[PDB]
A paper describes a structure:
CDT is a member of the Iota family of protein toxins which also consists of two homologous toxins produced by Clostridium perfringens (the Iota toxin) and Clostridium spiroforme (C. spiroforme Transferase, CST). All three Iota toxin family members are assembled from two polypeptide chains termed the “A” subunit (CDTa, Ia, and CSTa) and “B”, subunit (CDTb, Ib, and CSTb). All three B subunits are presumed to contain five domains that are involved in regulation (D1), oligomerization (D2 and D3), and host recognition (D3’ and D4). Once proteolyzed, the mature form of CDTb forms a large heptameric, soluble structure referred to as the prepore which binds one molecule of CDTa to generate the toxic moiety, CDT.
During classification, we noted a population of the CDTb dimeric assembly intermediate bound to CDTa. Despite a significant number of particles observed in this complex, the three-dimensional reconstruction was limited to modest resolution (4.57 Å) due to issues arising from preferred orientation. Nonetheless, we have successfully assembled a pseudoatomic model of this interaction. The interface formed between CDTa and the CDTb dimer is facilitated by interactions with both chains of CDTb (buried surface areas of ~241 Å2 and ~122 Å2 were observed for Chains A and B, respectively). Though we note the resolution of the map hindered the assignment of residues at the interface, the CDTb dimer is confirmed to adopt a prepore-like configuration as observed in the apo structure (RMSD of 0.657 Å) and interacts with CDTa through a binding mode that is similar to that previously described (RMSD of 2.203 Å). Moreover, our data indicate that assembly intermediates can form interactions with CDTa, suggesting the enzymatic component spontaneously associates with the intermediates that form during assembly.
Author numbering:
A (entry chain B): 218 to 313, 320 to 678, 682 to 746
B (entry chain A): 218 to 315, 319 to 451, 457 to 748
C (entry chain Z): 67 to 463
The structure:
Amino acid sequence: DLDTDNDNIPDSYERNGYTIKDLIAVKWEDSFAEQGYKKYVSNYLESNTAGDPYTDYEKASGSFDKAIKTEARDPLVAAYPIVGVGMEKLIISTNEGKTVSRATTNSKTESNTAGVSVNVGYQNGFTANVTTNYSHTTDNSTAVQDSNGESWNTGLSINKGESAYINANVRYYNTGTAPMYKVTPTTNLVLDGDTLSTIKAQENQIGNNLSPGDTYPKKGLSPLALNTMDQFSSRLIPINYDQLKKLDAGKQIKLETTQVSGNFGTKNSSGQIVTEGNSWSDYISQIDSISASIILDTENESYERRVTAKNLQDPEDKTPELTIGEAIEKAFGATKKDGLLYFNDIPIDESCVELIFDDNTANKIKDSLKTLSDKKIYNVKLERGMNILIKTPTYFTNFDDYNNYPSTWSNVNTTNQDGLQGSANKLNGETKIKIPMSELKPYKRYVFSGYSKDPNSIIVKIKAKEEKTDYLVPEQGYTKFSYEFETTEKDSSNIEITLIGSGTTYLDNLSITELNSTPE
Amino acid sequence: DLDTDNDNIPDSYERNGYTIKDLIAVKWEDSFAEQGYKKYVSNYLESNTAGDPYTDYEKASGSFDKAIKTEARDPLVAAYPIVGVGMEKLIISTNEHAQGKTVSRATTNSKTESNTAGVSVNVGYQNGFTANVTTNYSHTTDNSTAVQDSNGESWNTGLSINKGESAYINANVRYYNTGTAPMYKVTPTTNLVLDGDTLSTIKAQENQIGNNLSPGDTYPKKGLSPLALNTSRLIPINYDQLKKLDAGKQIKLETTQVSGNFGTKNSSGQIVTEGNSWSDYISQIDSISASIILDTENESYERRVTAKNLQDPEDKTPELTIGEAIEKAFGATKKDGLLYFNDIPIDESCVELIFDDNTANKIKDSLKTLSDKKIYNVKLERGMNILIKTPTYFTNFDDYNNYPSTWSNVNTTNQDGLQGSANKLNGETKIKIPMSELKPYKRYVFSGYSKDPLTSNSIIVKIKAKEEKTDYLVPEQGYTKFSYEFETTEKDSSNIEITLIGSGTTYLDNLSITELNSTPEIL
Amino acid sequence: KEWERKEAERIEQKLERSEKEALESYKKDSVEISKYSQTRNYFYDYQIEANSREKEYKELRNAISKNKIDKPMYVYYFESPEKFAFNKVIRTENQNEISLEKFNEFKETIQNKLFKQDGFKDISLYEPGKGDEKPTPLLMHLKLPRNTGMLPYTNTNNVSTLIEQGYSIKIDKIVRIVIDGKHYIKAEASVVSSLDFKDDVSKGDSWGKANYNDWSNKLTPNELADVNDYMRGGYTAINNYLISNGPVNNPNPELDSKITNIENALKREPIPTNLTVYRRSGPQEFGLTLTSPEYDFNKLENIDAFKSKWEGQALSYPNFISTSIGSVNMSAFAKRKIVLRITIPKGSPGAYLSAIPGYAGEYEVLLNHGSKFKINKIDSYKDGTITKLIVDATLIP
Ligand SMILES: [Ca+2]
Ligand SMILES: [Ca+2]
Ligand SMILES: [Ca+2]
Ligand SMILES: [Ca+2]
Ligand SMILES: [Ca+2]
Ligand SMILES: [Ca+2]
């Protein structure tokens, strides 16, 4: 029970699992989960298991400044904020006075799914996809709203040799697990390589503190304008003719956040809160190099966590490893019930949602999976330097408790027990679903994925912006299939999804996931 | 006896009984409740039960700044200042210094309009859900403007603005503070939001307000001069929103950022407000507390009440029912099964209830398991947003009756009511309510409760206004909250007629008429 | 901390040269000077006059007497259970839990008693937390009264509060608080003051003479004659008769009348205060001999056996008790290794004996026979190479 690092936790409780109850550390006797307690493990060469300012007893016991999320309660997942900026409107004016103004919508994870390449059938134990480019939440991509495709140059009489101005509306949000005080975004604007003008904001004019979850401006409120800014008061961003005629094509404008600074909260003996001597400036550059990154994108909200893991090649560090399933169980509020992880009600699983990987970590995890005999990627060792994106289906049925398809699927029978996850379907005849434009976002990209087994040829038929029908012969075990398509505008016809089997096949865990947006 | 935190009150006295008298702490034995003394409940895990910069001792012993409301002396309500903007008069002139063409209208600012602007009622309410769901929940930050002295006339008629120029805008503004907290170093910011376009942001600075904004009071002290927007310059406008404003839409007032400090009693004398700020404790407060808004027909209050988390053994935080939370949040006299303000009775059947999507869904989830089927006995979870609307007119065939007209066929000689007495319906019931008590161009909902101890004995109701209707109400052995919309119009119209034809067996109770929002007049 | 530091440099500008030199002398030698101030009074007058630490001790005591407080202050400090006659460890440093039964033992040990606090001691003004030193599981949180000594002083990067405790304490309450997951005992006690003189013997003589100059006129001639006998040699015969179980084994009605006269004379003038006196007791007063191996306190086991036998007990002297206001060592009983410290409540019988002219008694006071002392504490020190004991006892009626 000797203490090596000064944190007042016995070392036997840190090698084993321990929980904090009665504001003290007791060993995990594997009978406190039904109470509602959870288990932590702390490293002993350093009193801070993760590199956050808060210490292992304070972090693992809930002694922090209360404003952070509840998912940073473990001493393994740190709490630092990841701000983000988006645009919700565009104004183009020539006065230093014609004006054209439209609406824009932002997606946090759109460039991360921009370069991912899909394959029909995954011919390994990988059963996933690898993207070429990994983008965080802090950068984001925008789409202008409906305008019937009319040219932007017919509303402004601007020729070669003249410059228009940017006016817009912006919103600040957080997706991490921390509020950051004295908000100084210092964001930037890029337009396919060349930047137009960086955006510099001050502490008091925008919101001083910016808590996670909620936004500045709040949900369902007017976004903050660029005219009401001391820098952009007598001048705005100028544009030449070539740039606007390039934006006449199917192109988009993107935002990033470059560098921020500010203080953090702490406690006091005489007072209670002071945020002057604190800073995040010298703590981010430790967290960014020790841990591994997870990003999730539900269709309404994105989350990210940063979970620590050991390097394989060095005996000298005693930071305990994790597997991928336990890492997403601890990082997220993932309840593991019947062996399956659920965030709130959306299932999260290798067999239920889409997982997207970068290029470097894919090689290492494919090397590790050959050692693994389970051939499932939730049990491989999480190491330092992992970057994983996970995307939720808009619609995903598993012929089970989770069903969200907006139209009923024709010829579906779930009277079987040999499905991969609970019951499955039988393609005795053929399954079909009509899904119109009003239930879908316009001018997008999608992939349709699922698990099949055949203990025969199966034809898929997708009515889309381009009709696509295809064949696939299934295996006796489960092989994941996926098919890419794109849709067209709202006033068009529908999406008809048709699957004709051979009578003796089983299909389970069928999903539709958003990938990209088609240009115009 | 045993001490945990940096307070004199022991953890045994910190829970299940909590009384402070003559600067000492004693438990509670239900005897000296009439000596001006109350049992509180606080935490025993920390000094500050809420995010306030005051301990549970001082606020429950009076050792704090006296400008704070006495409802905040309870440790379970967070002291929280809210600074809002009311607007009263619009003047439009074409000059850039202040001659020119001027038009002038007098407006009313409503706080609780856009929260319930997209609220529609049902003829029958399912399960025990006697409430509604809003499209969006709003706090008292936004104000919605209703022009009352608006004859049939375009604003272009008084301006004759042709193509490219326009006039300038000026207005009369007021600054209210409604909360359980004052604020001293006044520096507010407020945007003039026009349906997605930011017209301008006004900052009042410090010298135009003074160094005090106490709760419950405005900077114009009740009846004083409206503050025009010239003291800091004029605001322009363009000739694109003029017809847009003329047709259907209104200008919204949105407070954005209010800076200020608070006062702490020093060792020697009066408060000090230089080493303080209402900019650090605010996010600490908002993270734990729920939000209970109440809107009387003349005023509003809103309260931050600390609530709990069910999905953890580790936390020890007080849990409340909804009705008791309202009781301790605003201060309510406990009548026999009833809650009272100074005159308004409040219940789950005497006021109107608004929740957003998440709160309404989780309350409907909780309604499946409660064995009493009431809103007010629901466990209080951190992060609820609940709006209460005190009805404009409400009667119960009992002691309270505030209706201007008198009905027809009123039989109060019965006691099988929802609350005490009921009404025996025999035939018609006629009320011919004069229009002068009804605001122009407003949406009003009539709500009632029906109990019919017969298989198919039903009534009709019939609301006669400019937008009239005849509805067929089918009551059952229990009561239903039945609600019908209608719209008031401009003043040159007649009375509102409400007829109902009963069938001699049906019973009604808890009849109320309330306002939702304003309908857009054609201009 | 901020307030403490503020009147630390507020005090520091009013201090003198020898006072501040003694202040750094204590800053470098805190523990030894504190243990010296505990037990210096039991030496000789010339031992104190030739002691090296005495000039710094008196300069610091002058500084403490100069700095008085205006309001009662709740203060905090850590100290061993052995200080409060709990001659054992409540919880060790590797232990974090003070159990309910050992808290009950501490309650039933430290209750209803007055315990001495003498010499210079450091304390803390606010409740210690995580960033402070917590050497012991015993934190006392005392209401120091008005005008008590108060020295906030900045030592290097820290600040500390030094006082001259010169009082006993009554422990009103103890509670079981928790700091950094470790159980600590937080003691809410009361400062209870008694009149003590120690080495200040001339002023105590003046007080006894002023309180007892007219006492001889108020006695009967039988009482006055028996008092004159007692101060002229009758103390030997009277005390020998009383220890020998006089009225039972060998009844002497003349000696019964004599001791009744002495008892009524002591009842004539009860004392107007709570007092603290000292007595150079022999081993024969404690059931031991000079040849007893237990009498040699130079080994620790004799000290511990004496503490086990005598602390927390009631001791009865069936004879009249002759003590004095002085705590100093004398040539008459420097041989004796027992120094008894007695606290007398107000209104108890007794008189100051050295107010009568013609008596060779040195600042002596007398107590009635059959008296009982509740032994509260036993401490130890080194008089030369001889270990001597300090027995803090209180007169119970
Ligand atoms: Ca550790
Ligand atoms: Ca450790
Ligand atoms: Ca399934
Ligand atoms: Ca306490
Ligand atoms: Ca508490
Ligand atoms: Ca009634």
